[PDB]
Design an enzyme around this catalytic site. Structure first.
Site, PDB file in Angstrom:
ATOM      1  CB  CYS A 161       6.338   7.868 -24.512  1.00 56.21           C
ATOM      2  SG  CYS A 161       5.949   8.346 -22.612  1.00 56.21           S
ATOM      3  CG  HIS A 169       0.954   3.667 -17.998  1.00 58.93           C
ATOM      4  ND1 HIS A 169       0.820   2.732 -18.758  1.00 58.93           N
ATOM      5  CD2 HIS A 169       2.396   4.179 -18.046  1.00 58.93           C
ATOM      6  CE1 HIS A 169       1.709   3.051 -19.713  1.00 58.93           C
ATOM      7  NE2 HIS A 169       3.024   3.115 -19.750  1.00 58.93           N
ATOM      8  CB  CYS A 206       4.421   1.889 -22.580  1.00 60.08           C
ATOM      9  SG  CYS A 206       5.551   2.687 -22.155  1.00 60.08           S
ATOM     10  N   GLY A 253       9.546   2.716 -24.781  1.00 58.62           N
ATOM     11  CA  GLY A 253      10.380   2.098 -24.539  1.00 58.62           C
ATOM     12  C   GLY A 253      11.475   1.785 -25.416  1.00 58.62           C
TER      13      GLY A 253
HETATM   14  C1  LIG Z   1       4.805   2.971 -10.192  1.00 54.99           C
HETATM   15  C2  LIG Z   1       6.631   3.912  -9.638  1.00 54.99           C
HETATM   16  C3  LIG Z   1       6.059   5.151  -9.247  1.00 54.99           C
HETATM   17  C4  LIG Z   1       6.547   3.136  -8.184  1.00 54.99           C
HETATM   18  O1  LIG Z   1       6.196   3.770  -6.876  1.00 54.99           O
HETATM   19  P1  LIG Z   1       6.610   2.908  -6.074  1.00 54.99           P
HETATM   20  O2  LIG Z   1       8.170   3.834  -5.381  1.00 54.99           O
HETATM   21  O3  LIG Z   1       5.995   1.488  -5.754  1.00 54.99           O
HETATM   22  O4  LIG Z   1       5.580   4.148  -5.029  1.00 54.99           O
HETATM   23  P2  LIG Z   1       3.691   4.104  -4.510  1.00 54.99           P
HETATM   24  O5  LIG Z   1       2.858   4.134  -6.001  1.00 54.99           O
HETATM   25  O6  LIG Z   1       3.342   2.425  -3.649  1.00 54.99           O
HETATM   26  O7  LIG Z   1       3.719   5.349  -3.411  1.00 54.99           O
HETATM   27  C5  LIG Z   1       4.316   5.053  -2.595  1.00 54.99           C
HETATM   28  C6  LIG Z   1       4.145   6.462  -1.853  1.00 54.99           C
HETATM   29  O8  LIG Z   1       3.439   7.298  -2.336  1.00 54.99           O
HETATM   30  C7  LIG Z   1       2.446   7.770  -1.721  1.00 54.99           C
HETATM   31  N1  LIG Z   1       1.974   9.245  -2.294  1.00 54.99           N
HETATM   32  C8  LIG Z   1       1.531   8.308  -3.926  1.00 54.99           C
HETATM   33  N2  LIG Z   1       1.082   9.376  -4.219  1.00 54.99           N
HETATM   34  C9  LIG Z   1       0.491  10.338  -3.540  1.00 54.99           C
HETATM   35  C10 LIG Z   1      -0.028  11.954  -4.073  1.00 54.99           C
HETATM   36  N3  LIG Z   1      -0.006  11.925  -4.398  1.00 54.99           N
HETATM   37  N4  LIG Z   1      -0.251  12.466  -2.780  1.00 54.99           N
HETATM   38  C11 LIG Z   1       0.184  11.945  -1.731  1.00 54.99           C
HETATM   39  N5  LIG Z   1       0.817  10.583  -1.032  1.00 54.99           N
HETATM   40  C12 LIG Z   1       1.166   9.573  -2.411  1.00 54.99           C
HETATM   41  C13 LIG Z   1       1.885   7.393  -1.230  1.00 54.99           C
HETATM   42  O9  LIG Z   1       0.758   7.121  -0.574  1.00 54.99           O
HETATM   43  C14 LIG Z   1       2.841   5.961  -0.981  1.00 54.99           C
HETATM   44  O10 LIG Z   1       3.749   6.285   0.367  1.00 54.99           O
HETATM   45  P3  LIG Z   1       3.791   5.017   1.443  1.00 54.99           P
HETATM   46  O11 LIG Z   1       5.520   5.043   0.813  1.00 54.99           O
HETATM   47  O12 LIG Z   1       4.420   5.833   2.784  1.00 54.99           O
HETATM   48  O13 LIG Z   1       3.459   4.420   1.914  1.00 54.99           O
HETATM   49  C15 LIG Z   1       7.396   3.237 -11.033  1.00 54.99           C
HETATM   50  O14 LIG Z   1       7.705   2.136 -10.607  1.00 54.99           O
HETATM   51  C16 LIG Z   1       6.789   4.017 -11.926  1.00 54.99           C
HETATM   52  O15 LIG Z   1       7.008   5.061 -12.400  1.00 54.99           O
HETATM   53  N6  LIG Z   1       6.997   2.704 -12.901  1.00 54.99           N
HETATM   54  C17 LIG Z   1       6.197   2.495 -14.710  1.00 54.99           C
HETATM   55  C18 LIG Z   1       7.208   3.003 -14.885  1.00 54.99           C
HETATM   56  C19 LIG Z   1       6.738   3.178 -16.813  1.00 54.99           C
HETATM   57  O16 LIG Z   1       6.064   3.860 -16.679  1.00 54.99           O
HETATM   58  N7  LIG Z   1       6.542   2.475 -18.130  1.00 54.99           N
HETATM   59  C20 LIG Z   1       7.792   1.175 -17.820  1.00 54.99           C
HETATM   60  C21 LIG Z   1       7.282   0.677 -19.469  1.00 54.99           C
HETATM   61  S1  LIG Z   1       8.530  -0.511 -19.987  1.00 54.99           S
END
Ligand SMILES: CC(C)(COP(=O)(O)OP(=O)(O)OC[C@H]1O[C@@H](n2cnc3c(N)ncnc32)[C@H](O)[C@@H]1OP(=O)(O)O)[C@@H](O)C(=O)NCCC(=O)NCCS
Ligand SMILES: CC(C)(COP(=O)(O)OP(=O)(O)OC[C@H]1O[C@@H](n2cnc3c(N)ncnc32)[C@H](O)[C@@H]1OP(=O)(O)O)[C@@H](O)C(=O)NCCC(=O)NCCS
Ligand SMILES: CC(C)(COP(=O)(O)OP(=O)(O)OC[C@H]1O[C@@H](n2cnc3c(N)ncnc32)[C@H](O)[C@@H]1OP(=O)(O)O)[C@@H](O)C(=O)NCCC(=O)NCCS
Lengths: 729, 392, 402
Positions: C388, C358, C91, C390
């Site tokens: 932070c 991110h 990261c 990994g």
């Molecule tokens: C991004 C992550 C949270 C996965 O997200 P996801 O499960 O795909 O979810 P999405 O961001 O697409 O959002 C899904 C839902 O949340 C809702 N949502 C998200 N933020 C919202 C908010 N502020 N208000 C309302 N609804 C919200 C969306 O509208 C969506 O609704 P739906 O499912 O009916 O379409 C996760 O993979 C992650 O955090 N990865 C990053 C890893 C990291 O930080 N570092 C890795 C280094 S190796």
């Protein structure tokens, strides 16, 4: 989102709606403003309404059939609109093709089978409409064509042609077979490669066979009805995606092989087609389609596309519509043709005349030479037999029309003479004098001369009204131009008889007024002279050849200066010097003339002698002459490569302007097509006349930039690059 | 500010590509094996002072993806604060890792750093990572992409190196490499690779052909003319170098660098870091440089930056990627032949891409001590990296 | 020896993952577009003085493989002497590129260096490069591999952060990111992305949901419960942290960092280099540091690194005006805030990855340029940037306004 071009507050309709009792809609495109269907503003609005209607009535529609009421299916995009698109119009161009492809995408993802009834030519955007369908049926009729030839106009298939052909055949096959060269296939060849699925005998069976296929598809394959192969979950692109290990091994060689084929010429369309194909294969269909639009907008707003659309569409149609042909004369069919001389020119004229279907009498001084001239046609047919182009019965009849002879009386009953002997005015008087009485009374007397004026040659025949210049180009079986020179006593009737003959053998004619050098030989001389002058100035011979290839010529100049004999270039130099010295003037020798005599003194006068700028062994060319560097002190002059390239292009462009001023050329359409098809002027320029009005460089664009760049060349390389007053103000 | 010193510089033997001994060894295991050797040579080394582990890797995919340097820290049981970063500068990744480590010590913000590289070309072949310079047609078409092999044949054509000239250097490398092994020059730096049972897997550079003869090298066929023809890269190179007519293909599998597997590790630290852990400095990083040539300047740049000339260098070490590149480098700077790659090079022993830089660096650290010489210059080849070290 | 200065710090807008605007744009084009912006800001910049281009990239495969930094040098038309190196420290790769460039400038052996990163997560998903820590069972079993997702939920469980607490910070990030955009804070830093025709592709951060409410965040499903059951990483985590009976999965898609595409570039050089090229220094790199903590929890790395860089500069929390920590997960920021007692008005004042996204390899250089602009806007002195990492790593950087 909208299927229409405008969404704020009236074209004519081009599509006819018809729904049968079964629920099959038949969309029949029939633009009333012309004779062909073309993606104009009327089509986009008409197809926008029909697609909106297919969605509103989807509960009562089971299938769709796209057909045409014209002789052609669909002729493609509107060239008259795209050529006017300025760089600031990129947003309008992008939204237009995005709207066109949004309609086809809705027709494609309708959930119902869609069949294309191809009743004729489906070119460019026309095939893209058919590619959006789920099944394609073509009528095997005479004259029908299919392909995506927008690369020949400096464009790319921007209506989903690149996106869908790659989805059907893969990156490698779709690019090589269809996209890169824009080849046009006949329905038999189209079904073989996969552009067409089924064939029918006549056009009356198309719509019935389309509805029959819809009925069977719904009963046999109810789940996959109206779903393209790439709209399925288990879709695997043929040859793999760019992330596949097999394709990724050979993928880096695709742009390099393209630079090898294009020889570094500045032609952006093949580059954009290859980029859109690979980039599109990495993403989904809709994202790939949008990438295709962005590359299409960059080409249409560019200058190279406007140069090609000017030459290969407007200028070429004006020629094919009797633009240079006289207005009052009718037609005169040709019975038997007589070719004088059995050299590469005479033998080539006999082959193309027999390939068209005319009777040919090939006469030379001896029967041994006339048979060796017919052998040129035999070895071309023997090569066409093992490749599978022509048949055995059709090739035997071709050679049967060529009658080799050495006796002058065998020309009895010839109404079209095409002389192709040695360049000598006294000889052409002697050869024409022996036969002018044996041939028919109203027979055309053509002379395939390079520089000798037709007015002077006509003094050796009795009827000078039928004497004309018919200039071919070696090799005759490949070069598609015939320069028709009009003498001072040449009539208008003979001008049309040769014009129609040129169209009968499948070549493009231009009309040129009589002058020493005509237009092709005069302009092509300035191109080879600039290279020879550069060789004398001390430029590396390898850089000179690279400058010629990267300029866009089919053959580098020194290599071309060997196919053309240096003994001929020496004779032309004496002729121009004689015409000025004997008239009371001082001759200005071109600096290339000194290089010509130096090579003749060394005994290297071209490929004919077996040695020239290149070394020749067993007839095959291989390598530059090692003694060429020491002879002219090569390496002592290292000008910029673009300066070498511009010196060759500007020498031809300025000389082409002189031919227009002196009245040698009547129109700029003949100047462009004549330079492209005759002397191999680079197609990306659109011709040696378009190169002036469509010039592009770091200085600017247009005639003003051409003049400023010509003066920059004249200040450093000689006053011969000064622009004529006809380009100034 | 602070001076950077080299305390250890070890490496693994280089196993060949086809039927290689290290093909069964994961590249992560090649690095852990070297880390455990550093622990054996310094049992009372507080590894909490090790602030970073920098590894070069040109194809960081598969077994080499996911920050293999961080994997080495966790797999070997190093402190979790020891960091771990992978970088890629093509063939110079190994020397760039050492150069970066040295620069991080000069800044004062790092104290003791491990640096090196790893490349298991038999398990992760070159090009497995893809890229844009080859798999994006718009970029490939514009930048005029040409493989390094065609450029090597082009250099031999421009500078006038014959097929026998490059084969003469290939024989030179095989002899000097065999003489170095027989003399025991590599005995204390080449760490034999073993399995989890302690059984020997490899203890020598098995790509060497010490019985190479001049007649045998002449029998080899040009290996880079099937790609130049089917790929058309010859025409692409000549479109830029338009004054050259034909490219003389003189490079074969005997006068070019070898596809091998290997890894190297260098322990760079400050003077205070060595005195605190009881480590004896073996050499000192004098200066580093980065430059490029027409699509030697990095060597000239590091010489001017250290206030030295060609005469002031006792040993020159240039990676033997291709024989023509070394002959060009020798001709441009007028390098005495008895100072250039004295213990052989990549032509004989192999060229593990990500690790070669740290391998040829540790070779000069040993040869400077064996000859009791002072200065050595290491360089790698359109980029370029050069480093000057001085014996301590 | 030498002093490193930040002369420019730009970034692209962050396009979201699903139906993203940047999905059609190659990650190489994102970097070239930023290189072209630096040219427009300094048309008389002698690019021969640029000695290296250091880019961070976590997944250097496909469109991002083959040294994307060197590809950006050749594709943009920069001199062949301008270097080009890719690195990957998960990261904090973007911040490690900046820190490495600063250290190369301090050494005196480099004069003008470009630093940053690029990550097109919609075209190259994370994990595409593989790795032994995940795909090799021998080392995966030994290092006790657990995704950052579960470690974040473990932080909230130990520290006692409720589902409402992490959603409260998610609401704070959305509000502060919206105010910064509407307030024009990102006017000069965010460089819009355009195609080869000049047409607009993206000019704002798509992932933002400015109308976020606390009621909407409470309706979201815990996103990291499918990895906890099918993968068994819950049981793996509690084997190391044996005093915890159950993990409270509080992190959703609304309180976690977004998956986006983007790139960032930072121009770093010496005082002499800026004087030769007529450049005005915006900030000075004070100190950098690297450390971390336990690999299973994986996210408690920045706290030992932040303390390390404060001791190296002789500074404390009271001496720092702004704190910028990457919003990978809400519990990580709340723990970093409690451990060092960071005032809420000093922490991530212009939003973070929860709202804006991110882009892994570029986030370190993006938040670095965000603090350069906010110090200048507030006329403050110091800012501390940390991320932070990994595996349990951490990178910190202290900058000073000039
Ligand atoms: C991004 C992550 C949270 C996965 O997200 P996801 O499960 O795909 O979810 P999405 O961001 O697409 O959002 C899904 C839902 O949340 C809702 N949502 C998200 N933020 C919202 C908010 N502020 N208000 C309302 N609804 C919200 C969306 O509208 C969506 O609704 P739906 O499912 O009916 O379409 C996760 O993979 C992650 O955090 N990865 C990053 C890893 C990291 O930080 N570092 C890795 C280094 S190796
Ligand atoms: C090694 C490379 C030249 C290809 O080699 P190769 O032909 O696959 O290798 P081989 O060992 O099979 O050599 C070919 C033949 O020459 C023989 N040969 C090689 N060296 C020999 C020597 N010194 N004496 C005698 N024979 C020799 C081999 O035994 C083999 O014989 P065979 O074909 O009958 O089996 C190529 O892969 C390479 O490494 N090029 C440079 C890559 C590079 O620099 N990449 C850039 C990274 S940024
Ligand atoms: C860069 C370098 C490797 C080039 O090698 P070189 O042998 O000097 O190459 P040249 O520039 O002389 O070019 C080689 C040949 O190509 C010729 N050439 C180049 N462009 C040409 C053109 N357009 N037309 C014709 N010939 C051309 C040259 O005239 C020369 O011919 P010659 O060898 O018969 O005289 C070498 O010069 C070098 O290392 N220079 C150091 C660069 C430097 O100072 N860097 C700064 C570090 S801080």
């Amino acid at each position: 989102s909208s299927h229409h071009h405008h969404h704020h507050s009236m074209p004519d309709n081009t599509i006819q709606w018809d729904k049968d009792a079964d629920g099959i809609v038949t969309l029949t495109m029939d633009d009333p403003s012309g004779s062909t269907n073309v993606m104009n503003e009327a089509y986009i609005e008409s197809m926008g309404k029909a697609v909106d209607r297919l969605v509103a009535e989807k509960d009562s529609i089971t299938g769709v059939v796209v057909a045409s009421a014209k002789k052609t299916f669909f002729a493609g995009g509107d060239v008259k609109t795209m050529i006017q698109a300025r760089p600031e119009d990129a947003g309008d161009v992008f939204n237009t093709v995005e709207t066109i492809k949004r309609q086809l995408r809705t027709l494609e993802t309708l959930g119902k089978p869609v069949v294309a009834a191809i009743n004729g030519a489906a070119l460019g955007g026309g095939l893209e409409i058919a590619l959006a369908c789920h099944h394609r049926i073509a009528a095997d009729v005479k004259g029908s064509q299919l392909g995506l030839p927008e690369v020949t106009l400096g464009l790319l298939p921007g209506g989903g042609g690149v996106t869908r052909t790659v989805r059907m055949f893969g990156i490698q096959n779709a690019f090589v077979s269809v996209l890169a060269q824009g080849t046009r296939f006949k329905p038999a060849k189209a079904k073989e490669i996969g552009l067409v699925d089924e064939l029918v005998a006549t056009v009356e069976e198309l719509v019935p066979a389309a509805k029959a296929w819809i009925k069977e598809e719904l009963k046999a394959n109810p789940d996959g009805a109206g779903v393209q192969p790439w709209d399925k979950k288990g879709y695997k692109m043929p040859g793999g995606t760019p992330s596949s290990p097999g394709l990724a091994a050979i993928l880096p060689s695709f742009p390099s092989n393209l630079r090898k084929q294009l020889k570094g010429a500045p032609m952006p369309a093949p580059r954009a087609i290859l980029a859109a194909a690979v980039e599109g294969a990495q993403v989904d269909f809709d994202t790939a389609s949008r990438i295709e639009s962005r590359y299409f907008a960059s080409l249409v707003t560019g200058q190279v596309a406007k140069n090609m659309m000017q030459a290969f569409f407007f200028d070429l149609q004006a020629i094919n519509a009797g633009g240079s042909r006289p207005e009052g004369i009718g037609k005169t069919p040709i019975k038997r043709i007589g070719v004088l001389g059995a050299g590469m020119m005479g033998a080539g004229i006999a082959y193309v005349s027999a390939k068209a279907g005319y009777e040919v009498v090939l006469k030379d001084v001896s029967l041994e030479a006339a048979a060796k001239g017919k052998g040129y046609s035999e070895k071309l047919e023997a090569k066409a037999l093992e490749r599978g182009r022509t048949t055995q019965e059709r090739s035997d009849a071709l050679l049967a029309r060529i009658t080799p002879t050495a006796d002058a009386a065998d020309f009895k009953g010839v109404d079209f003479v095409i002389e192709a002997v040695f360049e000598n005015q006294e000889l052409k008087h002697k050869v024409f004098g022996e036969i002018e009485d044996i041939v028919e009374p109203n027979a055309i007397l053509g002379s395939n001369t390079s520089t000798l004026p037709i007015t002077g040659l006509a003094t050796g025949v009795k009827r000078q009204e039928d004497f004309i210049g018919i200039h071919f180009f070696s090799p005759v079986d490949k070069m598609p131009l015939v320069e028709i020179i009009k003498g001072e006593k040449t009539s208008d009737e003979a001008l049309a008889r040769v014009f129609d003959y040129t169209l009968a053998i499948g070549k493009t004619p231009i009309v040129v007024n009589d002058s020493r050098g005509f237009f092709t030989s005069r302009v092509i001389g300035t191109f080879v002279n600039e290279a020879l002058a550069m060789l004398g100035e001390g430029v590396e011979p390898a850089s000179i050849e690279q400058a010629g290839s990267q300029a866009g010529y089919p053959a580098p100049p020194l290599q071309l200066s060997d196919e053309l004999n240096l003994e001929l270039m020496h004779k032309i130099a004496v002729a121009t010097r004689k015409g000025v010295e004997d008239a009371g003037g001082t001759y200005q020798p071109h600096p290339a003339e000194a290089v010509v005599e130096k090579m003749i003194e060394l005994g290297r006068s071209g490929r004919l002698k077996g040695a020239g700028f290149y070394e020749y062994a067993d007839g095959k060319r291989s390598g530059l002459w090692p003694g060429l560097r020491e002879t002219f002190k090569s390496g002592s002059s290292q000008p910029p490569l673009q300066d070498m390239i511009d010196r060759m292009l500007f020498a031809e462009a300025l000389e082409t302007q002189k031919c227009l001023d002196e009245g040698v050329l009547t129109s700029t359409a003949d100047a462009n097509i004549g330079s492209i098809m005759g002397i191999g002027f680079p197609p990306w320029t659109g011709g040696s006349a378009q190169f002036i009005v469509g010039y592009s460089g770091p200085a600017g664009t247009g005639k003003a930039a051409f003049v400023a760049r010509a003066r920059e060349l004249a200040a450093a390389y000689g006053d011969r690059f000064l622009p004529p007053e006809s380009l100034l103000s | 500010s602070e001076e950077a010193f080299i305390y250890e510089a070890i490496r693994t033997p280089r196993g060949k590509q086809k039927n290689g001994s290290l093909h069964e060894v994961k590249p992560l295991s090649l690095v852990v094996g070297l880390i455990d050797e550093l622990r054996k040579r310094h049992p009372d080394l507080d590894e909490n002072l090790i602030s970073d582990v920098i590894l070069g890797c040109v194809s960081p995919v598969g077994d080499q993806g996911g920050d293999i340097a961080r994997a080495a820290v966790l797999a070997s049981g190093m402190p979790v604060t020891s960091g771990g970063v992978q970088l890629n500068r093509f063939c110079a990744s190994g020397l760039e890792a050492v150069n970066t480590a040295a620069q991080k010590v000069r800044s004062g913000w790092d104290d003791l750093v491990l640096a090196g590289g790893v490349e298991s070309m038999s398990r992760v072949p070159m090009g497995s990572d893809g890229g844009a310079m080859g798999l994006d047609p718009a970029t490939n078409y514009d930048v005029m992409f040409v493989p390094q092999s065609i450029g090597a044949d082009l250099i031999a054509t421009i500078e006038g190196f014959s097929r026998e000239d490059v084969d003469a250097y290939a024989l030179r490398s095989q002899q000097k490499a065999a003489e170095a092994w027989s003399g025991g020059y590599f005995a204390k730096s080449v760490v034999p690779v073993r399995d989890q049972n302690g059984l020997l897997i490899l203890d020598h550079d098995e790509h060497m052909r010490p019985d190479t003869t001049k007649e045998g090298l002449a029998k080899l066929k040009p290996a880079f003319e099937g790609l130049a023809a089917l790929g058309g890269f010859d025409d692409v190179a000549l479109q830029k170098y338009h004054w050259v007519e034909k490219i003389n293909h003189v490079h074969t599998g005997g006068n070019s660098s070898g596809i091998v597997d290997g890894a190297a590790l260098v322990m760079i630290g400050s003077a205070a870091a060595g005195k605190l852990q009881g480590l004896t400095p073996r050499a000192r990083i004098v200066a580093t440089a980065t430059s490029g040539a027409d699509p030697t300047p990095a060597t000239r740049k590091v010489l001017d930056r250290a206030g030295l000339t060609v005469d002031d260098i006792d040993l020159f070490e240039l990676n033997e990627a291709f024989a023509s590149v070394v002959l060009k480098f020798q001709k441009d700077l007028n390098i005495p032949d008895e100072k250039l790659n004295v213990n052989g090079g990549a032509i004989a022993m192999g060229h593990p891409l990500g690790a070669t830089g740290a391998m040829i660096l540790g070779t000069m650290v040993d040869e400077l001590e064996r000859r009791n010489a002072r200065r050595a210059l290491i360089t790698l080849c359109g980029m370029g990296v050069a480093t000057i070290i001085e014996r301590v």
